[PDB]
Amino acid sequence: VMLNVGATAPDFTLRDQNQQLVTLRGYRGAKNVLLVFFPLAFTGICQGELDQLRDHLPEFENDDSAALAISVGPPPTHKIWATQSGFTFPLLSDFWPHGAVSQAYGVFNEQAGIANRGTFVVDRSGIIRFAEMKQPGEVRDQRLWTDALAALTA
Amino acid sequence: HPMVMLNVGATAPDFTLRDQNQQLVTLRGYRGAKNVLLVFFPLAFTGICQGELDQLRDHLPEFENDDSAALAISVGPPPTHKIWATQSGFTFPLLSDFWPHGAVSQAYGVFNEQAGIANRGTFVVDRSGIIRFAEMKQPGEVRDQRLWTDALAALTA
C-alpha cells in the first residue's frame, strides 16, 4: 500500500552513483525533494522518464528543489547508466537490504523484486505532498512533478 | 545455507537462472557432458570484475569447448548483464542471482552478507556434479585464471 499525501516520508541513507551517502533528512528545512522510484536501469520506459528529468533538470535541481532517482541497482550500475545517459542528478541504490526504502514507501513489487513507478514530493518538513503510482505501459507526466514543486515555493 | 564456502568433494547446488538474454540456464543441464567453471563476481561495471571477465573473454576457447563450459554469476539482473556483455564482448553466459537476492551465492557459501554481493568465488563442477576446485577471493583481490584452466584440464575425458 503506497504512502499517501500527509504521511511523513520515511528517512533513508543511500549510496549515490559515486558511492557518496545521500540522506533525505539533509534536505529538510532547505528544499522540497522529488523522489522518483524506478524499476530497472537500462530499460526503455525508465530511460524515457529519466531522460525527461535530465532534459528539464533546472526545474528539479535549484535553490528550492532537489530530485533523487531511486532503484534497487547498485552504484556501479547507476554510474555507467548515468555517464552514458548524461544524468548528473543523484541515482540512489536501494540495493542492500534489497528494496528496503521502496518497501517503506509502499512502492515495492514483491514478485519481481523491483520498485514500481512511484513518485513523491517531500516538503521542507518531511511531509509527503504529492504521491503517484503508474501502471505498466504508461509514462509518468513530468509536468505534474514541476507543477507540484512550483506550488511549494510560490 | 552453508556457514562456510563449499569445498572440494561437495555436491554443487543446482540452480536455474536467467542469463543476459532472459534464457534459463541450469547447472544440471551440463551433467554427464561438460565440466563447468562457475565464476561468481560481485558487481558489473567495476574495474576488477571487468579485468577478470575480459581475461575470461580473451581466453574463451579454453573455457567453452567440448569438455568445458563457463558461467559467470552475480546479483545483477539480466538487463544489467546484457548491456555490460554487449559493450564488453562477453558471449559466455552471465547469470542473474537477483531475486531472491544472492540465493545461489549463499548456497555456495560465497555471499558477502555485509555488502550484499557475491565474493570472488570460483568453482569447477565435474560431470557428476561434484565440486573439484574451490577458491574464494575478496572483491579487492584478483584471481589467477591459470588455476582455472589447470583444474579444467585435469578433468578432461
Is A97–B115 a contact, with Cβ atoms under 8 angstroms apart? no
Residue B15, all three cell numbers: 540452480
DSSP-derived secondary structure letter, A39: S
Contacts of A113 in chain B (CB under 8 A): 98-101
- B84: Cα separation from own chain's centroid: 16
3-state secondary structure B3-29: CCCCCCCCECCCCEEECCCCCEEECHH
Residue in chain B closest to A43 (alpha carbons) equals B79
Do A98 and A71 meet the contact criterion of CB atoms below 8 Å apart? no
Q: Interface of chain B against chain A, CB under 8 Å?
A: 43-46, 75-77, 79-80, 82-84, 98-101, 115-117
Is B79–A112 a contact, with Cβ atoms under 8 angstroms apart? no
Contacts of A42 in chain B (CB under 8 A): 79-80, 82-83
Contacts of A100 in chain B (CB under 8 A): none
Do B39 and B73 meet the contact criterion of CB atoms below 8 Å apart? yes
**CB neighbourhood size of B89 (10 A):** 11
Q: How was this structure determined?
A: X-ray
Instruction: Please name the CATH architecture into which domain B1-157 falls.
Output: 3-Layer(aba) Sandwich (3.40)
Mutate to test the interface with B, among A42, A47, A81, A102 (most CBs of B within 10 A): A42
Residue A76: which of B44, B98, B115 has the nearest Cβ?
Answer: B44
CA distances from A121 to A33, A56, A98, A109, B126 (A): 6, 16, 23, 21, 55
Q: Name the fold adopted by A1-154.
A: Glutaredoxin (3.40.30)
Q: Using DSSP, how many helices (H) and how many strands (E) does chain B show?
A: 4, 9
Enzyme catalytic residues of B: 49
Residue A88, all three cell numbers: 548528473
Contacts of A77 in chain B (CB under 8 A): 43-45, 76, 80
Enzyme catalytic residues of A: 46
Alpha helix (H) residue ranges in B46-144: 47-58, 78-88, 103-107
Q: Which secondary-structure segment (H or E) carries A68?
A: strand A65-71
3-state secondary structure A89-144: CCEEECCCCCCHHHHHCCCEECCCCEECEEEEEECCCCEEEEEEEECCCCCCCHHH
DSSP-derived secondary structure letter, B98: T
Is A79–B117 a contact, with Cβ atoms under 8 angstroms apart? no
**CB neighbourhood size of B4 (10 A):** 8
Which one-letter amino acid corresponds to residue B77?
P
